Design a protein around this ligand. Structure first.
Ligand SMILES: Nc1ncnc2c1ncn2[C@@H]1O[C@H](COP(=O)(O)OP(=O)(O)O)[C@@H](O)[C@H]1O
Ligand SMILES: Nc1ncnc2c1ncn2[C@@H]1O[C@H](COP(=O)(O)OP(=O)(O)O)[C@@H](O)[C@H]1O
Ligand SMILES: [Mg+2]
Lengths: 472, 503, 49
């Protein structure tokens, strides 16, 4: 069955293992023995004779040269099934919530092929997530990949927690959260939030979300294989159960960065900015497996870090290429005080089409984007000269633009600790009606301070009336 | 069942023959150093024993770097690699029409096998200065902005360069959806066989693209060739050469063909992956040296053929994205340098309001008025000169430098023609309606008419002219030139419609 | 111009007196100096200047 070979060279993940009789194929799971915890290595390149270049997933400390390694002869088989809901696991398949082992029946392998072109769903139902900036300018696709770009401290995680606490209540389909390279603090808070919110249930077999965590304390081989873990769990729940799953993968730049760290150790020539040459195709296979198919639906919201706010970096650029709804959770609009600081110009969605979202939503959205682009040109002129150089047309555009730009902001339910407001769930027709009134210009007398952290437009009218009454 | 039986047992010859092989060294990441093939020829399709092709590049005295066409798990160290015996080739026919074909020849769409007849080598040499003749036919796209400022020639290459998410693939699909009315017509010279090579995209975008083309009934010009993200880097590398070879088949038979190379930068980055894995030295932005030679072969496979060589044309239009609008990057400078026509989208006009978002003066078509109809040439040259005047006077009089009657005339005509050039997605119009509407815009009759009202003017004007003026548009499109009686008739109809527009 | 919020305040006061003289007054035919006053009055009282 297995083949016993010998470690002869060790760098992190990159462990050159010598096989002389039983060399295994690429993408294999072979365990190092003599260890406290099972040290699953992953066979890649055979380089010389004997030389499987494995990537090592755990504590590399203590790997003596010439050490015996048992090759199991398969890719990384992990537990899947309905026995993994409400149960944390890490990339080997091991349960790390100390409740016991997985009592499932079948294993699914971490490494698989994408669904072919022959069977692909082409239907697009609008996912309305109760957020004004999303449902107005880049509305989500129920059955398409959704991406939350942004820098450090821009509100990606808070927006994910809004997306769980808003959409995950609706889908009866089994959700899957995959944390890759993020804070273990956030995975802990999310696990206790899923316990208290009833989304998982530690006394019954009727929990709803599975959890995979490969957090940022992990060596790079581990973090390069977490998205694959949570994705083959959610790919089981798509294929052989037929459910409408959600897949919340935070933060896919950690996957790509762990790939770059391993590849810098793997002896491949460095590509552009400092990444690997296989940035397009490794992320290509991993993103093509995240797809809605005929057999079932995936709605996959994934948070995608950008390094040093560069959208021209290769990993965010190819991730813009691999998506159906982007949302550029910028930072400068949070310097202005708007939370989430979603750049809505650079955020688009594939589903915005007048033959899909209707003519009213499309006209309101494109008018909002027009007013904000005219405001960007005019804020160049304003930043140099001032607002006393503009005409009546230009000043009405600037005033309507600041009103709209404050009205895009809303308070979320999960970020009620930072702000003071409660969680506002804005329906779709109230978003269209509010932005349509502000765009048509019926509110040329309310202050712009009355549209900040508001929600529905009647709350904006009430905030202006309460502001005038407290000034009375 | 029984027919399946007999085709299985008669089709495979099982004709064993002694054959050159060689064992495999390091099978790294889709690259395989193969020791032994001392008679392999450079850039040759070779075959790994698990049933999968690879392409032999980088012939060295040690070993041959074969780069695989697909997955890497299915290859070990020490297995055979059989020479197929010929350069990698693409099966081309006219029964390949309307069928999504994976990058070599393998039709992965679930509609049976391809009924090909004419195998063709994919790395062929492009025609020389004698077999080519110049652009003559007006390659129309249905976009008002393209066909009135940067017109395409049947015989030509013309970029669609922009930044991400601007409307470039949408311009390419407007170009595709226009040519239905020329396929189902009468003249063979008008008819279209196009090849949409989608490089490095995602499979659901190609699936919804095929949905839009089938719902628009596009599947007789079209040949969609998908080398998506999950495909290997040589499938993404080799896919636009395959579409070029299919276009060369149609061209050398004498049928007017085109190829849209969607996301050609993905070919550039897949070939960067291939060179850096085959250990070639990196050049600039880690792209190697011959990326310009790559795209230069790929894009100079297209110009009009001589009248003694069938008369078939090829129109190469590759789509390329920059990052942050940086035209000075390596791949945009190379691919601007090889092409001549290029359509520039800046994106700030997409968020400002014009669709399709050609931001313009950067965009140029070197074949110019030679690739227009006679009517559009008679109308839309003064439009381009007026837009140049308008852009420069608005650029220095941003603040109101000097406003005489001439400057407000320039800004009035410029803003009104700017709202002429707006056009909705997936709605291409024919050349005669374009001549009619740019006649209504440039030759007076719209200069003092409240620029927000131009779009309803467009809708009601096209409704009017399609309502009771179909034979006159037939006269315009079949006579070529817009005649003087048709000129004064268009003057009278636009005056009557100005009355009915202020009615 | 190029001098701040001068003409804004002047146009505000002028049209406020014009709206106050719209009721119970009729002949609000006006005179003005400079390009900026007629340039801020091409829209609301473009008849009455
Ligand atoms: N709706 C909101 N209201 C107020 N603050 C917010 C909101 N959304 C995000 N934030 C701010 O963003 C921060 C969270 O960003 P986070 O997504 O955790 O960073 P990262 O992107 O590194 O995970 C919080 O400190 C919070 O102050
Ligand atoms: N004429 C048009 N009218 C309205 N929208 C358009 C038009 N042309 C393009 N678009 C917009 O462009 C987007 C598609 O851009 P696309 O061509 O896919 O760019 P990329 O291929 O770089 O992603 C769509 O969301 C569509 O709304
Ligand atoms: Mg595209």
């Amino acid at each position: 069955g297995g083949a016993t070979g010998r470690i002869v060279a060790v760098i992190g993940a990159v462990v050159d293992v010598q096989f002389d009789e039983g060399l295994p194929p690429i993408l294999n799971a072979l365990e190092v023995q003599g260890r406290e915890t099972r040290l699953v290595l992953e066979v890649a390149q055979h380089l010389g004779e004997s030389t499987v270049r494995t990537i090592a997933m755990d504590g590399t400390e203590g790997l003596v040269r010439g050490q015996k390694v048992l090759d199991s002869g398969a890719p990384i088989r992990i537990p899947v099934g309905p026995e993994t809901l409400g149960r944390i696991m890490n990339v080997i398949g091991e349960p790390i919530d100390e409740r016991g082992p997985i009592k499932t029946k079948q294993f699914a392998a971490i490494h698989a092929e994408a669904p072919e072109f022959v069977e692909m769903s082409v239907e697009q139902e609008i996912l309305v997530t109760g957020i004004k900036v999303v449902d107005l300018l880049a509305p989500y696709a129920k059955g398409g990949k959704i991406g939350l770009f942004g820098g450090a401290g821009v509100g990606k995680t808070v927006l994910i927690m809004e997306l769980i606490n808003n959409v995950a209540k609706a889908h009866g389909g089994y959700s899957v959260f995959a944390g890759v390279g993020e804070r273990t603090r956030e995975g802990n808070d999310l696990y206790h939030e899923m316990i208290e919110s009833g989304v998982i249930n530690l006394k019954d077999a009727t929990s709803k979300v599975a959890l995979v965590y490969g957090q940022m304390n992990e060596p790079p081989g581990a973090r390069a294989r977490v998205a694959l873990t949570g994705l083959t769990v959610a790919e089981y729940f798509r294929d052989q159960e037929g459910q409408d799953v959600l897949l919340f993968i935070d933060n896919i730049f950690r996957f790509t960065q762990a790939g770059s760290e391993v590849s810098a150790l793997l002896g491949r020539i460095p590509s552009a900015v400092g990444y690997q040459p296989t940035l397009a195709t490794d992320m290509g296979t991993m993103q093509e497996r995240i797809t809605t198919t005929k057999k079932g639906s995936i709605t996959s919201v994934q948070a995608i870090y950008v390094p040093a706010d560069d959208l021209t970096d290769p990993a965010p650029a190819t991730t813009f290429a691999h998506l159906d709804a982007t949302t550029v959770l910028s930072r400068a609009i949070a310097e202005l005080g708007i939370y989430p600081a979603v750049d809505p110009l650079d955020s688009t969605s594939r589903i915005m089409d007048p033959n899909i979202v209707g003519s009213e939503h499309y006209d309101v959205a494109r008018g909002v984007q027009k007013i904000l682009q005219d405001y960007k040109s005019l804020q160049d002129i304003i930043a140099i000269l001032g607002m006393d150089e503009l005409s009546e047309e230009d000043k009405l555009t600037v005033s309507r633009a600041r009103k709209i730009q404050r009205f895009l902001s809303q308070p979320f339910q999960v970020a009620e600790v930072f702000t003071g407001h409660l969680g506002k769930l804005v329906p779709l027709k109230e978003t269209i009606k509010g932005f349509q009134q502000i765009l048509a210009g019926e509110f040329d007398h309310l202050p712009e301070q009355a549209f900040y952290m508001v929600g529905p437009i009647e709350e904006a009218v009430a905030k202006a009336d309460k502001l005038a009454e407290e000034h009375s | 069942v029984s027919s399946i039986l007999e085709e299985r047992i008669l089709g495979a010859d099982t004709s064993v023959d002694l054959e050159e092989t060689g064992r495999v060294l390091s099978i790294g990441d889709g690259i395989a150093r193969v020791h032994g093939l001392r008679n392999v020829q450079a850039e040759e399709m070779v075959e790994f024993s698990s049933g999968l092709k690879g392409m032999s590049l980088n012939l060295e005295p040690d070993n041959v770097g074969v780069v695989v066409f697909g997955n890497d798990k299915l290859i070990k160290e020490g297995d055979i690699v059989k020479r197929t015996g010929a350069i990698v080739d693409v099966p081309v026919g006219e029964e390949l029409l309307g069928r999504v074909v994976d990058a070599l020849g393998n039709a992965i769409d679930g509609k049976g096998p391809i009924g090909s007849k004419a195998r063709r080598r994919v790395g062929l040499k492009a025609p020389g200065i004698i077999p080519r003749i110049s652009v003559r036919e007006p390659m129309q796209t249905g976009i008002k902005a393209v066909d009135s400022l940067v017109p395409i020639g049947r015989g030509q290459r013309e970029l669609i360069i922009g930044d991400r998410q601007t409307g470039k693939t949408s311009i390419a699909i407007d170009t595709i959806i226009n040519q239905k009315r020329f396929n189902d017509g009468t003249d063979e010279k008008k008819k279209l066989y196009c090849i949409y090579v989608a490089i490095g995209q995602k499979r659901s975008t190609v699936a919804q693209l095929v949905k839009r083309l089938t719902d628009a009934d596009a599947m007789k010009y079209t040949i969609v060739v998908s080398a998506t993200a999950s495909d290997a880097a040589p499938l993404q590398y080799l896919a636009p050469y395959s579409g070029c070879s299919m276009g060369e088949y149609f061209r050398d038979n004498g049928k007017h063909a085109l190829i849209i190379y969607d996301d050609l930068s993905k070919q550039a980055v897949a070939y960067r992956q291939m060179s850096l894995l085959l250990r070639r030295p990196p050049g600039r932005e880690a792209y190697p040296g011959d990326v310009f030679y790559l795209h230069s072969r790929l894009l100079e496979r297209a110009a009009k053929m001589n009248d003694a060589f069938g008369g078939g044309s090829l129109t190469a239009l590759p789509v390329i994205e920059t990052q942050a609008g940086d035209v000075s990057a390596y791949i945009p400078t190379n691919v601007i340098s090889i092409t001549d026509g290029q359509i520039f989208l800046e994106t700030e006009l997409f968020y400002k309001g014009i669709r399709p978002a050609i931001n313009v003066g950067l965009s140029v078509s070197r074949v110019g008025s030679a690739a227009q109809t006679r009517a559009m040439k008679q109308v839309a040259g003064t439009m381009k000169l007026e837009l140049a005047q308008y852009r420069e006077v608005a650029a220095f009089a941003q603040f109101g430098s000097d406003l005489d009657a001439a400057t407000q005339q320039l800004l009035s005509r410029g803003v009104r023609l700017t709202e002429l050039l707006k056009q909705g997605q997936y709605s291409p119009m024919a050349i005669e309606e374009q001549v009619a509407v740019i006649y209504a815009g440039v030759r007076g009759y719209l200069d003092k008419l409240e620029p927000s009202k131009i779009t309803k003017f467009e809708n009601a004007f096209l409704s009017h002219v399609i309502s009771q003026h179909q034979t006159l548009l037939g006269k315009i499109r079949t006579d070529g030139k817009i005649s003087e009686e048709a000129d004064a008739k268009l003057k009278e109809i636009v005056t009557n419609f100005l009355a009915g527009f202020e009615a | 111009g190029l001098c701040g919020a001068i003409h804004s305040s002047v146009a505000k006061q002028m049209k406020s007196e014009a709206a106050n003289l719209a009721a119970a007054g009729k002949e609000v035919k006006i005179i003005g100096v400079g390009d900026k006053i007629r340039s801020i009055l091409h829209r609301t009282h473009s008849d009455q200047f």
